[PDB]
């Protein structure tokens, strides 16, 4: 269908991939750093979801450079993807409002 709905879909699939890759890379970057908690996959995945949604619980976060880099990619992909949906919903509303104006 329309570009905005495809982009939304694409963004979602992409986000889910970043989430998974992010979980795997966080563990890899963090293991080896004393005091690190982002070291098992199940919670790292919870961490990536937390991060991508910016929910801010603060129960887990990276302590290494590479882990922080992985964090930036994840949050940014999350902010962007959700902003994309917002933009897609606006395109939907703007298009329907034009119709409701018989023009």
């Amino acid at each position, epitope marked *: 269908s329309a570009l905005h709905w495809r982009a939304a879909g694409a963004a979602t699939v992409l986000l889910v991939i970043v989430l998974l890759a992010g979980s795997y890379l966080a563990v890899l970057a963090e293991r*080896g750093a*004393p*005091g690190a908690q982002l*070291i*098992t*996959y199940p919670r790292a995945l919870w961490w990536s979801v937390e991060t991508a949604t910016t929910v801010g619980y603060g129960d887990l976060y990276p302590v290494t450079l590479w882990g922080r880099c992985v964090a930036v990619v994840v949050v940014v992909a999350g902010i962007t993807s959700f902003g994309l949906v917002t933009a897609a919903l606006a395109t939907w509303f703007v298009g329907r409002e034009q119709e409701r104006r018989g023009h």
Partner: antibody
Amino acid sequence: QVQLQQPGAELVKPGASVKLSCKASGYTFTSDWIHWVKQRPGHGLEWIGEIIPSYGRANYNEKIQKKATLTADKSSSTAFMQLSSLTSEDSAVYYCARERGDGYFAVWGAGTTVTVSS
Amino acid sequence: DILLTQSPAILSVSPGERVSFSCRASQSIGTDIHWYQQRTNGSPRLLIKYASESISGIPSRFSGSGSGTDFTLSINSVESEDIANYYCQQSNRWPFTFGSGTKLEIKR
């Protein structure tokens, strides 16, 4: 069947250096980590280090003198541990274990009794 | 590093009694503790993961409890086959660490 296989023993002369092996079998995920644990007679379990085969990245217990080096042959599903310049202090049973990246060692090898002696 | 204290080091129980092994961490670690059993000259065997989750193939009389810094591994009605060393292990913070272990001893 036996998921981890280690040679029962290895004899090493002081200053020498042996390479222990750990052949794995059963379900193999990319997320698997192989750990190595040292147990001196009488004493308890001491974590040595870890390695993730699907990347070759390894980490070591930095609280103890570093005498190990880990590598892994993805082809033959085998983990290797290179111990170098051993002394009487390095004689003990070395276990290897498999961790599915979720924090616990589900399965351990039978362990290799390394004896450093002339 | 996270210190895992297992005290007392030796437990003397009578056949059939209920025994309780203790594991105290130096800092809070949720329920990220795991229990292993090691018999004379055998290798470690996972008995309980994440503080209280039973593992398949382990006698129902084995269980664990606790969270934070105090953990307990309990055995309802001990028996000769249970005689061994019991270690706790933590996966909350890097690196993973093991308690010093407690030997179970049956007074028959």
